[PDB]
Design a protein around this ligand. Sequence first.
Ligand SMILES: Nc1nc2c(ncn2[C@@H]2O[C@H](COP(=O)(O)OP(=O)(O)OP(=O)(O)O)[C@@H](O)[C@H]2O)c(=O)[nH]1
Ligand SMILES: Nc1nc2c(ncn2[C@@H]2O[C@H](COP(=O)(O)OP(=O)(O)OP(=O)(O)O)[C@@H](O)[C@H]2O)c(=O)[nH]1
Ligand SMILES: Nc1nc2c(ncn2[C@@H]2O[C@H](COP(=O)(O)OP(=O)(O)O)[C@@H](O)[C@H]2O)c(=O)[nH]1
Lengths: 49, 433, 434, 31, 428
Amino acid sequence: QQKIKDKKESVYFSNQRAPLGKSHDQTPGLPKGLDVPNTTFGTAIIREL
Amino acid sequence: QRECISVHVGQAGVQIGNACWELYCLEHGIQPDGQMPSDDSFNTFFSETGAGKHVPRAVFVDLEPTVIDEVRTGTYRQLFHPEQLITGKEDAANNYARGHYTIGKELIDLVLDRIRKLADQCTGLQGFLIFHSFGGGTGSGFTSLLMERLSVDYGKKSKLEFSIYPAPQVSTAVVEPYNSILTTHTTLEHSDCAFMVDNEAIYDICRRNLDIERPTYTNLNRLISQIVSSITASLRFDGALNVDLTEFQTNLVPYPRIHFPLATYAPVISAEKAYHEQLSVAEITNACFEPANQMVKCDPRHGKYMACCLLYRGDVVPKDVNAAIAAIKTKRSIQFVDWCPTGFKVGINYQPPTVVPGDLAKVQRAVCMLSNTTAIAEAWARLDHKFDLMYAKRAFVHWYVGEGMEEGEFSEAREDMAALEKDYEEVGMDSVE
Amino acid sequence: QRECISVHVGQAGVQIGNACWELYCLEHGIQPDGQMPSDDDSFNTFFSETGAGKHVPRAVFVDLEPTVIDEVRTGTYRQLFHPEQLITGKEDAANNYARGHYTIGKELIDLVLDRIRKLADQCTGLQGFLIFHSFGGGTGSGFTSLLMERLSVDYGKKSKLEFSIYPAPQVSTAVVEPYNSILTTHTTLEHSDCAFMVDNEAIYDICRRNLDIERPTYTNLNRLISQIVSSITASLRFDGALNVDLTEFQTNLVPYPRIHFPLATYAPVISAEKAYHEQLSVAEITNACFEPANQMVKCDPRHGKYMACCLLYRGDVVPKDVNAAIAAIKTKRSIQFVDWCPTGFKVGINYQPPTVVPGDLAKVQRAVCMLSNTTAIAEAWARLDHKFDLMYAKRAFVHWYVGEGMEEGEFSEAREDMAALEKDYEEVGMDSVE
Amino acid sequence: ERKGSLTLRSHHKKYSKPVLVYSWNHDREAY
Amino acid sequence: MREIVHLQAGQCGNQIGAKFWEVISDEHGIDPTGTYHGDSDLQLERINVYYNEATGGKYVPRAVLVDLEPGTMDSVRSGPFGQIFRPDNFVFGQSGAGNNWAKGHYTEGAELVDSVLDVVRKEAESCDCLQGFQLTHSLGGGTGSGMGTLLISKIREEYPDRIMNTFSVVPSPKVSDTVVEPYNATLSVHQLVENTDETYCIDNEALYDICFRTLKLTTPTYGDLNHLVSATMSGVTTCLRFPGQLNADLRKLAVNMVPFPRLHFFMPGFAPLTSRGSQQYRALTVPELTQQMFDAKNMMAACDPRHGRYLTVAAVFRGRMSMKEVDEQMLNVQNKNSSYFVEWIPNNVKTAVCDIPPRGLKMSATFIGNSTAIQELFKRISEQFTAMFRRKAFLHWYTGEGMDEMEFTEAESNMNDLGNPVVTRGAC
Ligand SMILES: Nc1nc2c(ncn2[C@@H]2O[C@H](COP(=O)(O)OP(=O)(O)OP(=O)(O)O)[C@@H](O)[C@H]2O)c(=O)[nH]1
Ligand SMILES: Nc1nc2c(ncn2[C@@H]2O[C@H](COP(=O)(O)OP(=O)(O)OP(=O)(O)O)[C@@H](O)[C@H]2O)c(=O)[nH]1
Ligand SMILES: Nc1nc2c(ncn2[C@@H]2O[C@H](COP(=O)(O)OP(=O)(O)O)[C@@H](O)[C@H]2O)c(=O)[nH]1
């Protein structure tokens, strides 16, 4: 817990834009409820007829 | 039926295999234990025994412990057959002499016996994918010995290499020019196709396109694992242009010696960078030929592409690729050699790329671009210069010559690479006759 | 089909485009987020169709300094712009044209052109480029010139218009506007096919004497500029009786290959509790265009001859009260023309009424932005010329440029090209006697 | 290396009733 | 009756033939289960041209499916009309062709060709009056190019009096789907030119020009492309399959479109082709059928008819139709663009009318052209071969499988000995 509170006090820094094994704590740059593991990306193919 | 055998040598080879197999289990549906939670797509890389407990076709051999012990102690302990995991008791210690001559013989019979045993339950064998670097002593000398003995025993089979190219600016060792020069001199006559992968370029693409300022080798190996799964996708699922390893061999290399392609991957894009793109086939084709998604740090416009093999994976219409290659072949930044009017080998698979819990994104499309080009000549020549300056006054030669290697192997390797540079220049020169 | 790419450079260009894209997102049905709320093709010009309808724009926002684009990426419209169409620098151009063209800037021009390449690749018919620069700083002058050069080299023959903020006749903000403006005009006079100007003090006056606000600020100015830009590009977006295109502007407004400098004049600038009392008919709003106080540049047009005007009516404008009003303006003897150009007043009419941002402008059913090429702007060019002469009489502020790496002699050909522009303006202003 | 049905052969095919064979006249005679 | 033995070589040939046994199966009313569920009694009268029968009314195709890799085979079995073929006829082999004509013709291709000939001997001895063999294959790549031309050689050697039809796809100028397509196409055509009687060169770029310009589609798939192939590849054998006035079998198609034995390369074309956006505005009649035939957009070979003179035109029409229209319209064509038809062959245009249109249409037609325009394709492939053969490139696997230097030069000389007669006809 001393390490958990240490990193909670330390998440005010450049640590949030350079996480040790992550990217950005990506969530504020997506829609609110989105389910990032789901929702395949890009434009799908419509395939009319 | 259409299977391939994976070999993993060295620290790099073992952790690349770790990433590749944790990708393959998620790709198929196999849990880390081995039981699939519940039809024939598995058969290429995963063998099947009683009580449905699917096992990889991989030989993990490394001459020093604790790295295989991570594998056989961690979560994927119950997936691998422990007699595949081959451990020595002495680290090769960045010496090709210790990789090829002294501690290669106590373990080469065991690893070849296991390779033969996996060849036994293989009806039509397509070939080998051997995973290493050009760095440490294990992944240099032991893979040189493996390519020699495998060319001896399975000479008609296709043998392909996944080699971590030594980083041209940082390095992780000071004898990397020696080790790389020796392993490529002794695998040039036996390797059929050697996919180069760098570390500098994967750091750069992880900072630019993956948006991680703090990446580790887990992320690095996950990107390389996506490359391996992308080229070995037609052997696994069905597709439009079902491509083969022998077809890779006949397309990616014109001459008997010019067999060092470069691998690139498109959608390397990282969640809050792809909701704003259509991810259409044209722009994901352009991303391969842009000079920043190259995964080997050599500049393409200072050279000419010999042959490009494009591997489209997922929902790809078979003819936006036609429009994209048509758009590419009119441009001037991408230059082809004059003796190769044809330039492309297109393969299309209908399986979308899976996402590992981690860095990359759930994209409906992907493409792996394997290019044989002349631009790798500068990459070879700079380490040839590095060899010449380090060898001009006999640095680090005493370990190599005193462990059992003769002196003349260094000179033979240097002359072989002078010949290789001369070949690159002769091929890159245009026609006047 | 009918799309064009917007490049927004400098702090002025970035803020102008902030209020701009603020206007266009409410022009169409696009949220601050980007999806259309709840449940035809007008979005295509300025927005794309990335899957499940996210609608990312076609802007490539550049700044050689931080914090200005960082407010955009951490405020309101932070979800709508792509993170890599907003490129930032780690230093400042610092009012130094040499530090917009050389030193800082050449490390970033590669990434800027690469993003421009990607957006151009995802376009079928790329109608043109729209550069929003400022003529006053370093970021909007030197990087603008470098951009103009490389854009002209790689994407040739395509229309490329600048919507710039011309330096004030007396007011200004900085001290090196003469140097910066003359230098970038010299560099970008032979590549930019056309360039409209607006002036800060003129917007101040038009917002103090029509908008009834006695204390406007940059947001208040930028909303009117956004309305001008939207009236220019609304015909490329919606349907009307006489559709006008970017290439059609590029041919109609510019007589000579060097004289490519029109001035904007937006009309109905009425102020909410003044708008219910006029008829707001077509004749009087045309009179408001050609009246020399609604001009968006502080340059008196009575000191000169009009060369070509493009009127862009939007709203429920009947096609031929335009005819009556243009004939009425033609008959007046103080709005004078060059004798060699009888056809002067160009009609574009759009069935799109103006859309009001919460702010100063009112609900108007008719609006125009009159675009005047005239030889009156030779006086403003001459006063900036005289400022440069007083500047360079004793080599003030030259040490920064020279110690950067700009050659000492470049001021001389900048001065010579400005003298050439003065001579071309005075030669095209004269009456034909042969 | 023969595989089942490729050892067994014939020199004449048998056809169903609504098939125009050579002996269409010959069997349609005797129907 | 006259049976037509069908042969599939290569992945391209297998998928094209799979769409063939889609299209003619639901033309002839054969369901996926193998029974007969039709509507008319006329559609079983010539069922003994593509389907052998088994016990209980199981109509099995007389198609021998050949591939060097057993994955396209499993794809065909898992396809819609997969459980229709003979299970013994799925002649596979656990090996790798690897897009090498040497590895398809002088190697395990020549090891599997014996079993392939055994099952073709099966299907040709169980007959009475055999007319021809059709092979679907790809000139580029292997398997279809490798064992395909080998199959042509052995089949024509051991039955020398039957028609050979080769529905072959050719490389396009815009792209290439394999970097050894020039080599494979040269070695394939060198064996095709003193063997076969009718070839059909079908180009993918021409297919996309058809699909994008005329059909107005945005996402054409391989089912789309091979269905366009299968339309003509069904339409050519329709006077032999269904009654009509001026019935013309494949053999007199051969004698009418072959003036000289080398010049037998054809450009196909199917032309009741309507976009869905213009189907309701279409006015389907024989004059517009010919006007959509002869424009330079609907031939499936990517080579331009405006750059040469036609030697022979053939039109197999399907549908109940008045042929005073047909006669006057083809005469209006022959006297309209007269310089694009050869003067030394008066009435170089053939007409064959079947009463029964394909299902879903009233009015259809397939167009077969023997013209000078194949010269452009031949010279392009010859230029690619000279460019990549001058510096010995992509060639050591060709040598290492048991080849010689002289075979490539003989193939190139045979390409030029094809180019010479097709340019002598351009200047008479
Ligand atoms: N993907 C991946 N690559 C690695 C990893 N570790 C090392 N490498 C690469 O391998 C090079 C040096 O390690 P190796 O060549 O694999 O060393 P080795 O083959 O195990 O031989 P020894 O050093 O004697 O143990 C480095 O330059 C890296 O580029 C890893 O953990 N993951
Ligand atoms: N309309 C509008 N004009 C502005 C704005 N900011 C600056 N300007 C004009 O631009 C001139 C100088 O600003 P810029 O040219 O944008 O300065 P810069 O691009 O930040 O360049 P540096 O100062 O070197 O960083 C001023 O005289 C203003 O007239 C703005 O936010 N809106
Ligand atoms: N029309 C059509 N052409 C195809 C299809 N599949 C592949 N092709 C063509 O076949 C060529 C490559 O096939 P190939 O390498 O010869 O397959 P292989 O014979 O098994 O080696 C490509 O150029 C494709 O254009 C298909 O389903 N339909």
